[PDB]
Amino acid sequence: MVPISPIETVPVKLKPGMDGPKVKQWPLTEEKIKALVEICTEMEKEGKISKIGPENPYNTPVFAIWRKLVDFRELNKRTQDFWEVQLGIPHPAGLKKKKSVTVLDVGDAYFSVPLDEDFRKYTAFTIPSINNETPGIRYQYNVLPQGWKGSPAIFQSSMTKILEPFAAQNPDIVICQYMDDLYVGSDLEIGQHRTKIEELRQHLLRWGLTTPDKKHQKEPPFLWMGYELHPDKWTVQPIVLPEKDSWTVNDIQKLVGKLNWASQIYPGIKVRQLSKLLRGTKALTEVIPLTEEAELELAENREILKEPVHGVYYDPSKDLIAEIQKQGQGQWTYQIYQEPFKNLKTGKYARMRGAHTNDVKQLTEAVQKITTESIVIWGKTPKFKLPIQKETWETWWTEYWQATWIPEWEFVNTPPLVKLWYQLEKEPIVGAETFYVDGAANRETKLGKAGYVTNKGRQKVVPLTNTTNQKTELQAIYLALQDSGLEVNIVTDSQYALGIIQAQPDKSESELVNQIIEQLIKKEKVYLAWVPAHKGIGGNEQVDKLV
Amino acid sequence: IETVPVKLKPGMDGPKVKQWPLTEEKIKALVEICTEMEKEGKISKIGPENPYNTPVFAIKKKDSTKWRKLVDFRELNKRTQDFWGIPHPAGLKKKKSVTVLDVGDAYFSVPLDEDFRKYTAFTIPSINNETPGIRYQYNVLPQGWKGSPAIFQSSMTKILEPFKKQNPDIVIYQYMDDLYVGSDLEIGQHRTKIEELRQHLLRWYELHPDKWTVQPIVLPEKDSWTVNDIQKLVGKLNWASQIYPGIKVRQLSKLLRGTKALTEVIPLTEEAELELAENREILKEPVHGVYYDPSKDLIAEIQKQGQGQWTYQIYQEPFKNLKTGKYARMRGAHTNDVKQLTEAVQKITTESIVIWGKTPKFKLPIQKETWETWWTEYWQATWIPEWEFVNTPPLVKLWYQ
Numbered sequence: 040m041v042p043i044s045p046i047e048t049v050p051v052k053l054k055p056g057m058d059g060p061k062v063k064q065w066p067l068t069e070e071k072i073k074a075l076v077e078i079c080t081e082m083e084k085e086g087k088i089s090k091i092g093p094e095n096p097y098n099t100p101v102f103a104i105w106r107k108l109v110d111f112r113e114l115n116k117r118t119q120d121f122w123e124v125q126l127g128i129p130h131p132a133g134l135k136k137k138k139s140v141t142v143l144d145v146g147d148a149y150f151s152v153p154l155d156e157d158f159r160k161y162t163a164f165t166i167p168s169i170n171n172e173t174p175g176i177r178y179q180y181n182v183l184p185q186g187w188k189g190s191p192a193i194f195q196s197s198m199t200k201i202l203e204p205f206a207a208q209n210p211d212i213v214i215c216q217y218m219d220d221l222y223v224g225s226d227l228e229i230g231q232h233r234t235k236i237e238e239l240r241q242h243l244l245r246w247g248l249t250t251p252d253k254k255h256q257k258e259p260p261f262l263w264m265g266y267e268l269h270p271d272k273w274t275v276q277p278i279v280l281p282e283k284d285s286w287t288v289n290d291i292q293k294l295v296g297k298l299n300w301a302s303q304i305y306p307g308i309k310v311r312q313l314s315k316l317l318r319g320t321k322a323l324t325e326v327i328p329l330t331e332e333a334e335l336e337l338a339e340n341r342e343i344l345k346e347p348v349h350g351v352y353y354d355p356s357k358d359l360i361a362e363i364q365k366q367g368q369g370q371w372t373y374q375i376y377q378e379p380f381k382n383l384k385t386g387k388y389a390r391m392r393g394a395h396t397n398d399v400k401q402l403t404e405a406v407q408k409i410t411t412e413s414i415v416i417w418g419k420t421p422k423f424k425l426p427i428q429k430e431t432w433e434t435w436w437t438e439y440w441q442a443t444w445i446p447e448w449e450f451v452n453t454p455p456l457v458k459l460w461y462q463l464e465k466e467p468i469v470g471a472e473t474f475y476v477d478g479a480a481n482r483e484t485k486l487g488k489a490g491y492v493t494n495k496g497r498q499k500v501v502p503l504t505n506t507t508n509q510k511t512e513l514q515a516i517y518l519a520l521q522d523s524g525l526e527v528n529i530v531t532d533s534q535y536a537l538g539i540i541q542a543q544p545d546k547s548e549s550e551l552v553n554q555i556i557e558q559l560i561k562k563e564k565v566y567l568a569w570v571p572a573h574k575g576i577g578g579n580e581q582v583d584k585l586v
Numbered sequence: 587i588e589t590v591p592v593k594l595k596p597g598m599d600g601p602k603v604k605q606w607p608l609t610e611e612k613i614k615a616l617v618e619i620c621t622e623m624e625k626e627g628k629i630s631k632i633g634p635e636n637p638y639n640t641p642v643f644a645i646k647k648k649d650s651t652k653w654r655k656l657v658d659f660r661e662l663n664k665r666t667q668d669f670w671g672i673p674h675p676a677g678l679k680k681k682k683s684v685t686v687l688d689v690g691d692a693y694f695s696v697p698l699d700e701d702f703r704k705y706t707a708f709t710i711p712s713i714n715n716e717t718p719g720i721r722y723q724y725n726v727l728p729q730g731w732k733g734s735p736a737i738f739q740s741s742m743t744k745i746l747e748p749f750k751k752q753n754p755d756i757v758i759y760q761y762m763d764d765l766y767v768g769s770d771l772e773i774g775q776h777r778t779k780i781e782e783l784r785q786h787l788l789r790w791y792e793l794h795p796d797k798w799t800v801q802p803i804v805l806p807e808k809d810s811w812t813v814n815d816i817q818k819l820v821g822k823l824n825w826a827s828q829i830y831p832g833i834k835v836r837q838l839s840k841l842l843r844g845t846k847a848l849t850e851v852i853p854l855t856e857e858a859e860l861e862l863a864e865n866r867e868i869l870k871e872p873v874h875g876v877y878y879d880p881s882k883d884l885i886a887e888i889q890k891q892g893q894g895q896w897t898y899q900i901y902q903e904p905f906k907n908l909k910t911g912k913y914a915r916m917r918g919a920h921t922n923d924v925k926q927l928t929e930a931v932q933k934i935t936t937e938s939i940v941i942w943g944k945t946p947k948f949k950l951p952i953q954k955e956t957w958e959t960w961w962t963e964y965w966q967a968t969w970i971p972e973w974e975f976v977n978t979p980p981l982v983k984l985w986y987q
């Protein structure tokens with residue numbers, strides 16, 4: 040016999056202060072008992088388990104579905120935490136094309152990785168006796184049991200340690216571990232590739248591990264995690280939007296799942312309305328009627344999802360490019376590619392929840408998201424193509440009160456273009472009328488007043504019902520914008536309105552803010568000045584609106 | 587040569603912090619560095635039985651093209667038991683000049699306590715999540731951990747004993763991997779003395795706090811005032827009245843009576859001039875009842891003033907500033923707001939280390955996603971402070987300009 044190299048065991052403990060499992064075994068039928076006796080006899084003959092005595096006080100139930108299945112949920116609750124087997128799911132667009140990709144089944148190695156001997160006593164289990172007239176057969180596992188908390192991570196680390204020198208001494212190939220399968224890609228000739236595959240089978244066999252001489256069952260195109268992987272391209276598994284006379288909540292969640300999923304390669308997917316219908320429902324069986332906007336959006340989706348679209352694999356010798364387009368209602372879409380018309384992937388970004396916003400902030404956020412995704416998938420920031428003029432961005436970031444930055448980018452003339460809709464002056468305007476505004480409300484009756492007095496004698500006070508202080512302050516500024524010329528100075532004491540306007544929004548939840556914005560767009564020059572209230576600043580008349 | 591037992595605070599488990607994504611070049615640099623460190627026994631590979639993690643990235647310090655390995659030990663530092671202390675040298679800020687030295691290599695000569703090593707685990711990530719990453723743990727005192735200067739303190743005293751006995755006029759302070767050396771000599775004599783101390787440490791950043799002072803509130807001096815000038819003056823004085831008690835604005839607000847054009851020149855009455863002069867005199871005095879409390883956090887606020895100018899205030903209680911300043915330095919960041927902000931945060935943190943011996947918590951005028959996306963690209967210090975994000979534009983910005 041050729042001496043098999045031993046696999047180093049991983050020291051495993053239980054959670055602090057906890058003890059091993061002690062669960063009562065379910066009574067089983069005579070047929071099931073016989074089945075488990077045969078199966079456990081074979082497994083003991085192979086060395087996966089070993090018979091133990093009555094000193095072991097731990098027990099884990101056993102079942103037959105025959106097939107033996109051990110329910111380790113209690114021992115899992117009592118087992119220590121392990122480092123994850125994965126920190127994420129690889130994305131197909133990050134894979135690099137290979138001339139040959141081979142699949143090797145290392146499933147037989149799963150029961151060949153030994154378990155820490157001091158921990159084996161916690162895996163004890165009992166087979167009941169026929170009519171329970173004898174003591175049940177007591178076993179404990181000698182290898183990683185399927186279903187135990189620590190089996191995938193220990194198996195993966197053991198396989199990585201075994202594969203490390205082979206991967207080091209063969210840099211012209213790529214070895215990847217996934218579950219109980221190894222994937223080996225290379226650009227060598229098919230003969231050399233199959234040769235080094237045989238070399239890998241031998242190196243693995245030096246630890247006693249067996250790869251099947253039988254041709255593996257997996258073959259192109261690979262179907263994996265909702266993906267299709269082809270020798271030269273990738274895509275998502277076929278996305279079919281069903282025809283429904285009426286739609287329920289689970290149908291809309293299935294549809295938003297299929298659309299969010301299809302959005303990674305199909306450009307232009309929109310999910311705003313369909314996901315908006317699910318707002319504050321929390322009822323899986325509730326039937327929700329579909330708005331007309333959801334019908335336009337869904338029709339556009341069915342038009343985009345008509346024929347298949349594919350993505351290409353990553354080529355590190357070419358540049359990485361990401362182009363963004365605005366879609367409206369806070370929706371943005373983007374394509375990441377290296378050659379024109381051949382996308383690596385696509386995606387979308389929806390604006391965060393907020394009371395006020397503008398397009399430049401949303402474009403910035405989208406660029407940050409694409410940057411993070413790109414660094415995850417490809418390890419580098421892509422060059423951006425953005426629908427915003429250079430001068431627009433420079434004015435924005437030079438005048439913005441916050442620090443902001445976008446990585447290397449260039450302008451692409453693809454409407455709609457992100458633009459600045461208004462810009463407030465830095466100094467008071469000579470020759471323009473000065474509008475002193477104020478508003479006030481009664482906290483109990485919700486009655487208020489909003490108005491202005493100007494340097495030319497112009498005045499206005501409007502009474503309001505069902506209003507607040509903030510509403511009357513905004514309403515005062517709005518009245519000043521309504522009744523003034525193209526150039527106007529505005530004086531307020533409202534820290535609230537100044538806080539809103541200095542955030543520079545072009546869209547808002549409040550229709551009053553939107554009206555103020557629409558007035559600001561029509562003006563040529565607007566200077567907004569703040570003063571402290573109740574300080575006896577003439578013109579600023581708090582008593583005019585408190586009557 | 588002998589390990590000191592180290593533990594965690596009662597009831598606290600080790601750190602389990604997600605590793606953020608890194609560019610390919612930083613990953614390669616970390617692979618090189620960590621390979622060398624593993625050859626030198628400073629770190630060792632670990633198995634899946636270690637569930638703890640601390641983020642790691644790579645930087646490039648000043649005047650150097652070699653990559654450096656930076657570990658974000660913030661979570662471990664707050665989860666590590668309190669080590670005890672030395673009173674802060676109050677004369678370090680008063681000295682004319684201070685030089686900062688990186689003494690982090692020395693820490694690698696002292697082994698780390700066995701049972702504690704598992705809490706220093708870190709992960710070199712893989713591109714596109716193909717592997718769960720290359721996992722390491724430290725065998726010696728790691729740079730960035732608060733226990734390293736506390737454990738090395740005796741050895742550092744033994745090494746610096748001859749130099750401190752030779753120059754009693756030089757103040758020496760230690761914070762994390764940094765050694766601050768303050769004196770009053772000439773720049774050339776200071777540089778030769780720094781070379782003397784570095785060769786003294788070998789066989790075993792110009793900073794001038796005297797050119798730094800606290801910044802008072804100033805009011806404009808004009809011959810003709812417009813309605814807008816007076817409105818801004820009244821606003822600034824009303825804001826300053828929260829800090830200084832006797833600030834009075836009624837005589838200046840008296841001039842704003844009537845609905846006048848903003849650009850209209852208004853002459854000052856005698857009462858207004860007198861009120862303004864009294865306000866100047868009040869503003870010339872320091873703030874009443876301003877003290878430091880070592881048991882409280884330090885809060886640093888930064889305002890972007892435009893044209894590469896930034897203002898900052900360090901305080902513990904509102905309107906009780908312990909420090910104020912204006913960073914307008916331009917160093918290869920003329921087109922990058924985030925780089926300017928990050929350099930400003932590093933300078934303010936350095937000043938706070940010199941003054942109080944600990945780092946402040948920042949309020950950054952930036953969106954969370956932008957800062958968290960880009961701040962590690964411009965970080966050059968070995969420590970990392972805590973920060974939060976302000977999303978509403980503060981009105982007081984121009985009152986610090």
Ligand SMILES: *CCC(=O)N(C)c1cc(Oc2ccccc2OCCn2ccc(=O)[nH]c2=O)c(C)c2cc(C#N)ccc12
Pocket residue numbers: 129134135136137138140213214215216217222223224225257259261262263268269270271352716
């Ligand atoms: C460890 C495997 C893994 O994590 N993933 C995501 C994975 C990759 C993969 O493809 C490759 C395997 C090894 C080397 C290189 C590649 O891909 C390069 C691009 N490419 C893909 C497919 C193809 O036919 N040619 C090609 O050049 C595969 C195939 C799989 C498959 C499955 C399944 N079932 C799961 C994960 C894979």
